[PDB]
Design a protein around this ligand. Structure first.
Ligand SMILES: Cc1nc(C)c(CN)[nH]1
Ligand SMILES: Cc1nc(C)c(CN)[nH]1
Ligand SMILES: Cc1nc(C)c(CN)[nH]1
Ligand SMILES: Cc1nc(C)c(CN)[nH]1
Ligand SMILES: Cc1nc(C)c(CN)[nH]1
Lengths: 348, 348, 348, 348, 348
């Protein structure tokens, strides 16, 4: 019994769509939904999507308010659509998926994921919702998350963090670590062994290991001494070189976080979306060092050290493929005389 | 139980809002309402009003589909709002009135016209709706239309024509001639003696008298001979003078209609709204004669002849006030040697 | 090697997309594409679709410029997408189908219809394009049109008319009558026996039989006499009754065409799309007779007479199902004393 | 002698509308007003209102630049319109009122508040403007503010703070505490005894009493000990419970301010407007505790303690009505064994 | 070989336009350019200019990514257009100039600055680009910047700072100090002796001299004592007077920076553009002191002290003209009894 005024009533009275009965007067102008409160219009939703305003408003109101996988993880697993929920992409302020199943009459391709239209699409299933583990078992393509064991199904432990209403966090009052399962053409696939990105911000970066605590506290030459990193080009790769017009390295988020405490810099997010590897046009404010495409990855420093220390350094240039967030990331490894020159997430 | 999807269901299934239950999926883009019909969007309403798209859509769906007074008549009588209906202005493709009573939650100032908010406004009442003659009796300010007698109330016979879904016509299968009543501060007013404009189109003009039949069939000098119009400047005023750069006269719609059969002309309606007197920037295609503001009135030729023949012609210039469509229309009368030079609906 | 400036170059220089090389400067404002011609912007395309302006522009430039099936026929046959072409819906000024195959990078779901994404969709194939009869043979779901015989495939003769650049016509210099074939899950279907709508306009209606020539020339009571139509309510159904406030019958386009020569009327197309049965809110200008939902079908009068004369008239009300344009159209048959009262394409 | 170019001249040259003579070239595109400065367009005003761009621009330029009552106070007193000024709502970036009196030709319902149209509306009068105390005396409905005594009129001391150009503050160089007067139907009404909200921000919260200084400095169990708050559920109500998936209590702004210093949290203002009680969808970043509708009020902790300590605690659940900012706020009081379980501003 | 999809490919893959070959699917909706990434639209550019969206997108992608003169300097020198580059105005998010030369087909007035159309316009030339010093020599009107000497041309040393991707800085890894040259009507003009504004922010203000270090550390009466500023009204002019309703003085950015550390204030930038003298509507949050037009200049305190100490103080009021950023700034000097009362950048 869906309607614009009923979705708006739910937004005004419940903070989101809660299936409540009622209507509030709504007015649509430009790409913004308004409601009349004591004679005047009050903005409820500014549409930043490529969907019609009322359709985007309904999808946002029907967004999942439970901790869910980060959009980069769902994308890396090939999720096309979600079963009976909307995964809201908070970075893009838009639905993570084009179509829906049992959510909105305008975007729905089906009411239930068991409809033959869904068979070729990778449907996201949530084991926390009743019947969705069974729906995953009968779906030809899909990705399932659960809080515990699924009889017979071999699990893949996902990252510790999940997104709750746009806030990435490692849950204390809620579970954020899920078991992951994937199926392609009716067959359960073996999810690869993988590292996970840490999903930290540059402004509120917090070290998550003793190595990371030492990197941020210690000076460059003494940290490299303590962790036996001589010859691995951490000076260029992690710390960054701000001496020439073109900024050198600076590919690990922790390096950007360290630099940020001393002097500010501009990071232009020219493809603003959640992704395992991010690309920024960086301009260092202090020196004027800059780089058009500086690929940045947020790995735990211990994981990055483990990755770089497990490479054969006897070749000038090669592609090193590492599974991170379930996807294969290609790193360009440059060496000279058995020592690393640079190691960066390869720009395709 | 109003909603956008329910108004749209009524539009799609009943042609207008009929109070039916149901919903159809709707999408709003730009200022247009669309509905999904077998996978594709079909336009239902393009907003040409200054109201929000969804609000205009609802008001148009809730328009009065019965023959109603033309907007120029309602305006001339000072109608501010209508009781429990929407008068759709088809010349502007917008609601004739700013607010509503018992129609739409966004535009409603009241649910019933008996609310004290309505007392200072001239409410339009329709005797054809049960209880509205009584509502008019208790309203402080109002305009009432009826098909027959109202006990005690002295009627004012309105024009023969009414607007049915934007089509002005003299009804054969429906009654279009109404009795009119008006109240100002609780007192039933004596509506003045009035002429009525004929509301005819230039393209499909039809004569409504023998004088009008003769005007369109006979040549200029023989019509003026037959009707003793010598010295009344019908050559300039009605027929029009296309000999100089500035078009002479041409203020009566019948004259424009006659000219139209021989050669076409451009009429720029720069204030496109329903009004007793219309103003056009006219460019005659055959001669190139033109005039920025050519005021045009559609009076029955017999009425215009009666008006001009009842004027004292012994003064160079004066204002002749005529009650047309219940309003006072000032005309400018120009004379010389006891004969008319020009007579036009005055530009203020 | 697709681009906005290249599509625009093709539009400006070839009238449509012809695969030519070149670019013209383009500017996009509002929902309109402009091109600079000697210092000033000239409109090329105004987007009336729900797609992004540049995407709609490309699809319209890449429209099929050959006579193709009318959108109502494709819809009735369940066509979801077209193979390597765009069917432009000129009644909606939008693409007939949501997605494309080998046409535009933004709307493409595949490059070739042989991709497994297309298997569950009914793909439209054009025998006039090389290899498309073979593509239809290997497609699981599809609709095929041809100019002649396909070995082994039993044909279904389609209507005489086809749409050429939005102009429906029976071709003299081009073939417009196609053989139709359909497959559901790999099985060649037996297309039902069907009547066809004539797709005529009200303004330029032309009779296509002696019965139709007689209907338009003869008076009501003598036509009904000549064709033994006494007791079939053609007076109400076809001719129309303009005596009461609610317009009676008027469900056959030929009747609207006949009425149109005597007096004009307003037809509000509230669901403006190509369909076998059309619904209009009609207001007769001469009488003021009106009806919110007047279903109108354009059948050849001989076909309508054959349909109504082949019905059992011994029941008050029943649903009469007729295959028209390959689809099942429900009609409502109302009888009394063995005679027809009304027979109209049923409003669901 | 109003004009768009004259309002723009005043904005460019005086920072607001100052009644100066002159014009600057203006261009309107989208919903933004621009001015040409040395060959290029410079944004003057981005319209975020539901009014036409030029109308909103004029109202914003004509905004009151003196300390005025906060919009929540005016709303709580039922103010419909202001006399000869615009109260700009900085939180909504729109005029606080639909219409004006003597301000803008597009929004004006009258030029002077003495016009009969204003009689039924509660007009806001400013005693600091000459003649407005007299206008209030003759107005049927209205709200008056003054800096001192009005002969015969019994005053209501308002809050210490007022809004100056969107900045809420307790004035040192200007008076921000006003006397308030209200009239309904020609009769001066007795304004109730009321508490006042403190209007503080979460990010720049400052304690305004020794109790508040102790709440922010002291730990939970020692503050409750010092102020004899045992059994009043301040642990749940003020401090907040972040242990379960649903966040417990957290209804006093000071509690949110204390929590904010330790760890951040998201507050979704889903009805973004000035109001005595605010509703937020809160997501605690540290724990993942969340609540869809967390009603938040900014009372001085001493006032909240006085309110909760003056309640009978011998009932399971009841509505406690408290006058705050002149309006009656309903609080839901939940008790068990003579002790408080929760006390929150009741969600209607 | 320019195209929208090629500019977008360059933005996605290089961070800006780099002349690379390739295309990415693009969609334009509203005034925003999007690209499809794994099924969903990702925003590439939100148009805030008065140019068409695709044109602004191309100009922004083709922006100069090298340290360039700040827009205020180019404006002060009368620059109309740039040679074969786009100077992006980051404060206005728009191109600094209306037209281009050899950049975009929509905005280009010429391909090379040697075309007679450019002769009357002051073209900006960059000596760092090959052939541009020669182009300047043959241009009738122009402004040239270089890193070193130009044979025969007498240089003007510009400011230390330049804008790199919107970041104003004094370069360490890149040169930001340029030599400036100007030509009017084929004749090299002598650039005047000039002071330079420091281009500092209020939030991240840093002292650039011992006098500035002392101003920020020392109290008002002791700083004035140390620098012999008694009688120069620094208390009013630089420190600001927040005691009356109208804020006194506060015309030097360093004064606003000092005040900012103690208490916050609102600065309304009503003409948001880069300029030597800025105008703000300031509201002090602590006191409620305010001023509609507070002209603010960021001079090094030593330079401002030198300017004010080099004035004759024996007149009530006079205009003091000082060349700053190459332009003549008029200062209003008010004196009494041989002492300064106020000294502010005169509001024209
Ligand atoms: C997360 C979110 N909420 C809203 C109201 C939006 C629209 N910009 N986005
Ligand atoms: C009379 C009318 N019908 C419609 C669908 C409109 C919107 N332009 N106006
Ligand atoms: C058939 C058609 N041509 C054009 C240029 C359009 C856009 N309204 N539609
Ligand atoms: C307070 C305010 N000033 C302006 C220019 C606006 C428009 N967003 N709002
Ligand atoms: C500097 C800049 N980049 C972009 C994507 C814009 C559009 N707002 N402006």
């Amino acid at each position: 019994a869906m309607s614009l005024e009923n979705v708006a009533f739910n937004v005004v009275n419940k903070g989101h769509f809660d299936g409540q009965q009622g209507e509030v007067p709504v007015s649509i102008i430009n790409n913004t939904v308004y409601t009349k409160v004591d004679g005047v219009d009050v903005e409820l939703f500014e549409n930043k999507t490529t969907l019609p305003v009322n359709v985007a408003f309904e999808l946002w109101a029907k967004r999942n308010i439970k901790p869910v996988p980060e959009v980069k993880i769902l994308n890396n697993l090939g999720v096309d659509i979600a079963a009976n929920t909307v995964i809201w992409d908070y970075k893009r302020d838009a639905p993570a998926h084009i179509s829906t199943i049992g959510v909105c009459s305008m975007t729905d391709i089906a009411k239930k994921p068991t409809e033959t239209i869904c068979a070729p699409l990778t449907v996201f299933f949530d084991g926390r919702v009743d019947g969705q583990v069974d729906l995953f078992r009968n779906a030809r393509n899909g990705v399932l998350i659960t809080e515990g064991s699924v009889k017979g199904l071999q699990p893949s432990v996902g990252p510790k963090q999940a997104s709750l209403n746009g806030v990435t966090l490692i849950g204390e009052a809620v579970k954020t670590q899920f078991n992951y399962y994937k199926k392609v053409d009716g067959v359960v696939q073996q999810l690869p062994e993988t590292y996970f990105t840490q999903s930290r911000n540059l402004q509120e970066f917090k070290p998550r290991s003793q190595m990371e605590i030492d990197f941020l506290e210690l000076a460059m030459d003494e940290f490299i001494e303590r962790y036996k990193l001589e010859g691995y080009a951490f000076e260029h790769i992690v710390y960054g070189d701000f001496s020439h017009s073109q900024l050198g390295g600076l590919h690990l988020l922790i390096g950007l976080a360290k630099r940020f405490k001393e002097s500010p810099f501009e990071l232009e997010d020219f493809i603003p979306m959640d992704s395992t590897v991010k690309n920024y046009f960086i301009t260092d404010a202090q020196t004027g060092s800059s780089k058009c495409v500086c690929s940045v990855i947020d790995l735990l420093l211990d994981d990055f050290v483990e990755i770089i220390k497990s490479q054969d350094l006897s070749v000038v240039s090669k592609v090193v493929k590492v599974t991170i967030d379930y996807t294969e990331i290609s790193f360009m490894l440059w060496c000279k005389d058995g020592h690393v020159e640079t190691f960066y997430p390869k720009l395709q």
